[PDB]
């Protein structure tokens, strides 16, 4: 029963379960323990929408990580076989690219549902009152608007490219293109979506790197762990692109 | 011309047309007749978005309703044939599962477009003014935020599971899995989406059951008729799951 989906799902469940407890600890448990604060309403959306993108971008990085390892070990020995653990990994690249897309659209829908919630309404009315209370016209903040317009726009075009990888995974559509075309989509356009995905997360952290309020006790913010693996994969893909 | 889609579409059109006139009567006709109020702007979205989910969740319940009837009539006679009306119904389960998904994504997009409308903007500005007018800081309501975060989160994961049922309906993808795998998705994961779909509607009616303002003249609110059939299907699936 689903022999080629056991390994990707177990890895997806481990990353999801480990990130969930990690994010739930920084956003709910830590405020509840010290300076008691409920914050229990953040679990259904504001916590799930921090597990889905990290699972989505990590599984996406695991698609091209073997492509980099397979190249350096080919040069490390000069010539021709792959270890068992690597060749088994190379086969499940199709499944990783699908789970990564399945969690990307969930992260997409959860994000588009932010202004729909009631918690967003009651915060708009409080901000509107607190602004009138202090006679502050023109609540506009220029550099903050720049941030939101960019990483939202990059996240959408980053998801559109993933949709091309997913639609070419249909066996009828997949068995309709020559290998040069299929390899052109899964590799050339595929790595672009990883690039737009990690920049979508870096621009989101405009200046949260230098801020110390992000670290609850000593743990880094959840986005620093998310973008760690894709950045490693991208720079090594660039090093290999140099004459070598 | 589409022989296997005549019966599902006629049933979908009957439920849609009957619910439309029923919802239009409670939301537009009743306020217009007594204590004249236009409310004509609610038709394009606020009325259509009450027909799509009821059509979506009813058609979804009609997928597993024969699976329950076929089991009780197998025990009612002890052994082996099905009546003509039932076996004809058993064949159109694939079409019902697709129309249910086609209206679920429409109900999804219509719902995500709520904060985009102008009627939502002009109500935010009125609420913000009426809050400043009465010097009420902290418009937050705890139990109302709990409601919105849950049923929105359940509706998204309930739609994601339907997407798995729809993607496995592609003939190239469908004719790529052994019967045990295909039956595992359409039945095990399929009934879960019905469970998450009806809870998505019950949590939406946090306390609207006891309220009498919902009943316009004597008709129940539209969600009570929607969740009626799925609740019947779910409890009978649970009764059959007991040793029997």
């Amino acid at each position, epitope marked *: 029963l689903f022999p080629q989906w056991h390994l990707p799902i177990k890895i997806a469940a481990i990353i999801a379960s480990l990130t969930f407890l990690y994010t739930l600890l920084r956003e709910v448990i830590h405020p509840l323990a010290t300076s008691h604060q409920q914050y229990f309403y953040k679990i259904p959306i504001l916590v799930i929408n921090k597990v889905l993108p990290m699972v989505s971008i990590t599984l996406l990085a695991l698609v091209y990580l073997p492509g980099v390892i397979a190249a350096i070990v080919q040069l490390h020995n000069g010539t021709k076989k792959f270890p068992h653990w690597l060749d088994k990994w190379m086969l499940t690249r199709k499944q990783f690219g699908l789970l990564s897309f399945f969690f990307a659209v969930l992260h997409a829908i959860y994000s588009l549902s932010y202004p729909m919630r009631r918690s967003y309404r009651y915060k708009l009315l409080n901000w509107a009152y607190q602004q009138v209370q202090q006679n502050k016209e*023109d609540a506009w903040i220029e550099h903050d608007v720049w941030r939101m317009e960019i990483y939202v726009s990059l996240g959408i075009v980053g998801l559109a490219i993933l949709a091309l990888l997913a639609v070419t995974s249909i066996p009828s559509v997949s068995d309709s293109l020559t290998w040069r075309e299929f390899h052109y989509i899964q590799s050339k356009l595929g790595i672009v979506s990883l690039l737009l995905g990690t920049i979508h997360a870096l621009i989101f952290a405009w200046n949260k790197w230098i801020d110390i309020k992000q670290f609850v006790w000593y743990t880094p913010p959840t986005f620093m762990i998310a973008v760690f693996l894709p950045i490693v994969v991208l720079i090594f893909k660039s090093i290999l692109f140099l004459p070598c | 011309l589409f022989p296997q889609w005549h019966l599902p579409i006629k049933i979908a059109a009957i439920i849609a047309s009957l619910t439309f006139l029923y919802t239009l009567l409670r939301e537009v006709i009743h306020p217009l007749a007594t204590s004249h109020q236009q409310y004509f702007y609610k038709i394009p979205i606020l009325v259509i978005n009450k027909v799509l989910p009821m059509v979506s969740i009813t058609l979804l319940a009609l997928v597993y309703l024969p699976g329950v009837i076929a089991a009780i009539v197998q025990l009612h006679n002890g052994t082996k044939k099905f009546p003509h009306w039932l076996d004809k119904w058993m064949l159109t389960r694939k079409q019902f599962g697709l129309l249910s998904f086609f209206f679920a994504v429409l109900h999804a997009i219509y719902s995500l477009s709520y904060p985009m409308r102008r009627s939502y903007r002009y109500k935010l500005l009125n609420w913000a003014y009426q809050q400043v007018q009465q010097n009420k800081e902290d418009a937050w309501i705890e139990h109302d935020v709990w409601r919105m975060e849950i049923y929105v989160s359940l509706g998204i994961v309930g739609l994601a599971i339907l997407a798995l049922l729809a993607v496995t309906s592609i003939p190239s993808v469908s004719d790529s899995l052994t019967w045990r795998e295909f039956h595992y998705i359409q039945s095990k994961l399929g009934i879960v989406s019905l469970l998450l779909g009806t809870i998505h509607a019950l949590i939406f009616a946090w306390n609207k059951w006891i309220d009498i303002k919902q009943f316009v003249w004597y008709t129940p609110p539209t969600f009570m008729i929607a969740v009626f059939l799925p609740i019947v299907v779910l409890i009978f699936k649970s009764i059959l799951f007991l040793p029997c």
Partner: antibody
Amino acid sequence: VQVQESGPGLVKPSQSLSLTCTVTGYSITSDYAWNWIRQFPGNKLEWMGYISNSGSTSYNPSLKSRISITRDTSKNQFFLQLISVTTEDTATYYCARERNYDYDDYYYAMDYWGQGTTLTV
Amino acid sequence: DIVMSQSPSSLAVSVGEKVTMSCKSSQSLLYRSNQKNYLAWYQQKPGQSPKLLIYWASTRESGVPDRFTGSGSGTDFTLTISSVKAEDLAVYYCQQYYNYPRTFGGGTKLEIK
């Protein structure tokens, strides 16, 4: 940051005064709102008004009419004008800063205060 | 205007002894959005400017001795000193910044005995 109040010490009743809150070592427009607090001889504090780093002001409604808080960003100064002073207006006037409003956790606190100046009518 | 009311107007204590000061509020100072109580505690030494001790009713200001601990939520807040020292002789005010205008308490004068 070193702040210092100034202004007259003795004024006649039914007159108009003007205090100063020359701020040194920091810019009055970056990330701090400055408030004006006065302390009556009976050890009773009262918040008169504040001025945001964008020129937005908000005064105590009990004396909103006869009050005005201006600034001179060219030299990091503030000005508190009491258009019609009275016997009740004699007190010690401090100008204390506070971290400006934030959408996440608003209204932090009035952390740093000045040494204040005494005013007599 | 939120009316702040401190229970002990002036209470005496000896060096090295626990003491508590109450600050009864008019309405709740708790923003239900982010559940933080907006109330601060100041300390005015004889002939000095009031310095901040505790903001948000529980967090000490950077540079405040550990013996100052504030607690409470809603409308009843308390400032506790574990061991009163000689330099803790001052007037302690509680203010609220829940909204405008800010209002201070009557002040609690601490007299060392």
